[PDB]
Amino acid sequence: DAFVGTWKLVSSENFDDYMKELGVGFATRKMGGMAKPNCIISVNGDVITIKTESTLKNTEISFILGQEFDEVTADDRKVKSTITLDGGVLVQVQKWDGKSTTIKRKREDDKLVVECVMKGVTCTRVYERA
Ligand SMILES: CC(C)(CC(=O)O)CC(=O)Nc1cc(Cl)cc(Cl)c1
């Protein structure tokens, strides 16, 4: 839809602080911090797929809006995720060990903007079309 495409990370703010708040250790934060992944979003019927590709780590999720699914995250959390579409924003919540984090993906001019919140930390990542 508005989201379908191949997207390249161009800017990131507060990602280390976000990863620290999730409990990610030094080595994994170090491998994630300077990475510039591609995000590839596609849709087939009811099923949306989001691939994240980077030199040292790839991940993929496929889901139906409003249907909880199990996910292994790039930092190896085993989470339960639910993704909904609210006002044109794709809103993902991940739940694990009594904690939650929310990841919101929105389209703003030429940008795919991703806002990641864990407790008091808010990280913003900006992608542009490859
Ligand atoms: C939602 C998220 C936290 C942020 C975003 O979508 O931008 C997911 C993300 O970036 N995962 C990720 C990061 C690296 Cl560095 C490499 C690989 Cl494979 C995956």
Q: How many domains does the chain have?
A: 1
Separation of CA 74 and ligand 1 centre (Å): 7
Half-sphere exposure of 72 (CA within 13 A, CB side): 4
In units of Å, what resolution does this entry have? 1.3
Structural domain boundaries, residue 25:
5-129
Given a contact cutoff of 8 angstroms between Cβ atoms, the answer to whether 38 and 53 are in contact is yes
Q: Which residue has the tokens 């609210």?
A: 86
What's the distance, CA 107 to chain centroid? 14
HSE-CB at 126 with a 13 A cutoff on CA atoms is 8
CA atoms within 13 A on the CB side of 110: 6
Domain of residue 100, CATH code: 2.40.128.20
- CA–centroid distance, residue 44 to ligand 1 (Å): 22
* 107 has binding-site annotation: no
Angstrom distance (rounded) from CA 79 to CA 103: 13
